[PDB]
């Protein structure tokens, strides 16, 4: 009946989103109890985009914080924790300039401390944090941490958990429960949740988020082709080369150049393939780029840009994506469309329309060549962005952790009945 609230600002690479959560005060330690109350998307770029004008990073938040004042009851403002967590955009800016990164964190801090909420800090999450907290969000919301059965008849094996795949703008994470031995400590995660131990694998591929992959494909196309095979025939734009090569993701790869699309699904496939280095593995088994990965297993939820890209293929292109072969065929069809043909399918705003080919190709290869899903394991992947009226991402897991809302053990160890 009486509710408590908490707020997370997800400071992502392309933009900031605010989530307000609520829960009953006298059931707050039950799994699946916390749920989303409201949300707000901050106008303009991510906080890292203000690296040279850090004051604007704090000001960017004001409109959404004003909404938070209206969404959370007044008498609760003071006891509502507020967190900001920043991900790969700020990790990348920290490589370029720790000083600029610090000024941006200082600016958002200054703004947030002016509000009546219990501000608990602005922090940059690690890649492991980001992966693990998204896995917690999904499994918390779907009540996978409940111990199913009853005395004398507990289900065995215990309830499975949902793997998580998150495609952000500047990194992508894969996280799942595994029985495989750990071969790299950087990928090894151990959780104690509701008296149960979960052995988890996680990895974050920095520079493999949607926006950085598009930049890297553009840089590659400029070098190899001087046309862009992933872009549709009839689409062209003036490319500012400074913007192409300024990222840590592309600096490894004449002020302005014209670049035109060619709708070449096969050349687009070849361009995307160059993103995955499969030449070496110092472990028993790898994903790509020499990174340890055990075999994928269990159900998975693919959210964020995986969901938005696949939704374009099914809803706008009207193509099935149920199998890896179907996803590949949909991508080929989409890439082979001319700019007029693509525009004919989208009566409204056309931002990002020239990018779905490249992003769909990337996703198909990431899953199939990168993570080594096959038809059998892919059948167990679902593309969804919401569970139990709450957006799926790392924000909820993060809040749950920092607010100590998930118990490591059940009260009084449930008298030992789960032993």
**Strand 163-167 to 300-304 pairing:** parallel
Calpha distance 141→121 (Å, rounded): 25
235: left (phi over 0), alpha (psi -120 to 50) or beta: beta
* Residues 44 and 98 both lie in one domain: yes
280 phi and psi angles, rounded to 5 deg: -145, 145
359 and 290 share a domain? yes
Domain containing residue 105: CATH number: 3.30.420.40
CB neighbours of residue 273 within 10 Å:
12
Confirm if 212 and 249 have CB atoms less than 8 A apart.
yes
Overall resolution, Å? 1.7
Handedness of CA 265, 263, 277, 163 (dihedral sign): negative
Distance CA 105, CA 364 (A): 36
| Rounded alpha-carbon distances, angstroms, from residue 236 to 121, 170, 339 | 44, 24, 9
CATH number for the domain harbouring residue 306: 3.30.420.150
Asked if residues 139 and 162 have their Cβ atoms less than 8 Å apart, the reply is yes
CA–CA gap between residue 296 and residue 201 (Å, rounded): 10
96 a known binding residue? no
Q: Are residues 186 and 319 in the same domain?
A: yes
Same-domain status, 194 and 308: yes
Contact 82, 117 (CB under 8 A): yes
Could you tell me if 376 and 411 lie in one domain? no
Cβ neighbors of 25 (< 8 A, separation 6 or more) are: 2, 3, 4
How many domains are there within the chain?
A: 2
Tokens of 244: 């192409």
Pairing of strands 228-233, 256-261: parallel
User: Closest by alpha carbon to 19, among 72, 55, 60?
Assistant: 72
Residue 148 sits in the same domain as residue 69? no
In angstroms, rounded to a whole number, what is the distance separating the alpha carbons of residues 168 and 393?
10
Is 195 labelled as part of a ligand binding site?
no
Inter-axis angle of helices 88-96 and 127-141, to 10 degrees? 170
For residue 69 the two structure tokens come to 């004042």
Is residue 9 located within the same domain as residue 37?
Answer: yes
By C-alpha distance, which of 410, 172, 177 is closest to 306? 172
Spatial contact of 397 and 136, defined as CB atoms under 8 Å apart: yes
Question: Rounded to an integer, what distance in angstroms lies between the CA atom of residue 318 and that of residue 330?
Answer: 9
Q: Is 340 annotated as a binding residue?
A: no
Q: Both tokens of residue 342?
A: 């693509």
Q: How many whole angstroms separate alpha carbon 294 and alpha carbon 282?
A: 13
Residue 415's domain comprises 1-125+389-419
Cα distances (Å, whole numbers) of residue 41 to 61, 84, 407:
9, 14, 31
Same domain, residue pair 84 and 119: yes
3-class DSSP string for the chain: CCEEEEEEEEECCCCEEEEEEEEECCCCCCCCCCEEEEEEECCCCCHHHHCCCCHHHHHHCHHHHHHHHHHCCHHHHCCCEEEEEECHHHHHHHHHCHHHHHHHHHHHHHHHCCCCCEEEEEEECCHHHHHHHHHHHHHHHCCCCCCCEECCEECCCCCCCCEEEEECCCEEEEEEECCCCCCCHHHEEEEEECCEEEEEEEEEEECCCHHHHHHHHHHHHHHHCCCEEEEEECCEEEEEHHHHHCCCCCCCCCCEEEEEECCCHHHHHHHHHCCCCCCCCCCCCECCCCCECCCCCCCEEEEEHHHHHHHHHHHHCCCCCCCHHHHHHHHHHHHHCCHHHHHCCCCCCCCCHHHHHHHHHHHHHHHHHHCCCCHHHHCCEEECCEECCEECCCHHHHHHHHCCCCCCCCHHHHHHCCC
Q: Tell me which residue of 99, 3, 92 sits closest to 49, measured CA to CA.
A: 92
**How many C-alpha atoms does 300 have within 13 Å on its Cβ side?**
24
Sign of CA dihedral 370, 371, 372, 376: negative
With the C-alpha atoms ordered 321, 325, 331, 333, is the resulting torsion angle positive or negative?
Answer: negative
d(Cα 224, Cα 274) in Å, to the nearest integer? Answer: 12
What span, in angstroms and rounded, lies between the C-alpha atoms of 336 and 328?
A: 12
For residue 358 the two structure tokens come to 């490249």
Phi and psi dihedrals of 189, rounded to 5? Answer: -130, 135
- Do 285 and 370 belong together in one domain? yes
Are 214 and 334 part of one and the same domain?
Answer: yes
Please check if 170 is assigned to a binding site.
yes
* Active-site hit among 106, 130, 329, 341: 130
Residues 99 and 230 reside in one and the same domain: no
Same domain, 327 and 383: yes
> Quick check: is 130 catalytic?
yes
Can the peptide bond before residue 157 be classed as cis, meaning omega within 30 degrees of 0?
A: yes
State yes or no: 164 annotated in a binding site: no
Answer yes or no: are the C-beta atoms of 95 and 124 closer than 8 Å: no
């Amino acid at each position: 009946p009486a509710l408590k609230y908490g707020i997370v600002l997800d400071a992502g690479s392309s933009h900031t989103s605010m989530f307000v959560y609520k829960w009953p005060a006298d059931k707050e330690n039950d799994t699946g109890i916390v749920g989303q109350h409201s949300s707000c998307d901050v106008q303009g770029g991510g906080i890292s985009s203000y690296a040279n004008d850090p004051s604007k990073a704090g000001q960017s938040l004001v409109r959404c914080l004003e909404q938070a004042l209206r969404d959370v009851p007044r008498d609760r403002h003071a006891s509502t924790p507020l967190y900001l967590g920043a991900t790969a955009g700020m990790r990348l800016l920290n490589l370029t300039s720790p000083e600029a990164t610090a000024r941006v964190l200082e600016a958002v801090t200054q703004t947030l401390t002016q509000y009546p909420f219990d501000f608990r800090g602005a922090r940059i999450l690690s890649g492991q944090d980001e992966g693990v907290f998204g896995w917690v969000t999904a499994n918390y919301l779907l009540e996978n941490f409940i111990k199913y059965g009853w005395v004398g008849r507990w289900i065995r094996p215990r309830k499975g958990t949902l793997g998580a795949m998150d495609l952000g703008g500047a990194s992508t994470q894969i996280t799942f429960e595994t029985t495989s031995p750990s071969e790299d400590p950087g990928n090894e995660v151990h959780l104690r949740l509701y008296g149960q131990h979960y052995r988890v694998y996680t990895h974050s591929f920095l520079c493999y988020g949607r926006d950085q992959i598009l930049l890297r494909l553009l840089a590659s196309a400029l070098q190899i082709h001087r046309f862009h095979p992933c872009w549709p025939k009839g689409y062209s734009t003036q490319v500012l080369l400074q913007e192409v090569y300024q990222s840590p993701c592309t600096m490894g790869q004449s002020a302005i150049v014209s670049l035109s699309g060619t709708s070449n699904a096969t050349l687009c496939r070849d361009l995307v393939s160059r993103l995955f280095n499969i030449s070496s593995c110092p472990f028993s088994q790898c994903s790509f780029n020499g990174v340890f990965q055990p075999p994928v297993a269990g159900n998975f939820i693919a959210f964020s840009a995986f969901y938005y890209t696949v939704d374009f293929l099914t809803t706008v292109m009207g193509l099935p994506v149920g199998t890896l072969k179907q996803l590949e065929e949909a991508t080929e069809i989409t890439c082979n469309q001319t700019w007029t043909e693509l525009q004919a399918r989208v009566p409204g705003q056309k931002t990002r329309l020239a990018d779905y080919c490249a992003v769909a190709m990337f996703i198909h290869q990431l899953l199939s060549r990168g993570y080594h899903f096959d038809e059998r394991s892919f059948r167990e992947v679902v593309f969804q962005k919401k569970a139990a009226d709450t957006a799926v991402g790392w924000a909820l897991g993060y809040m749950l952790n920092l607010t100590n809302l998930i118990p490591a053990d059940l009260p009084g160890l449930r008298k030992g009945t789960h032993f």
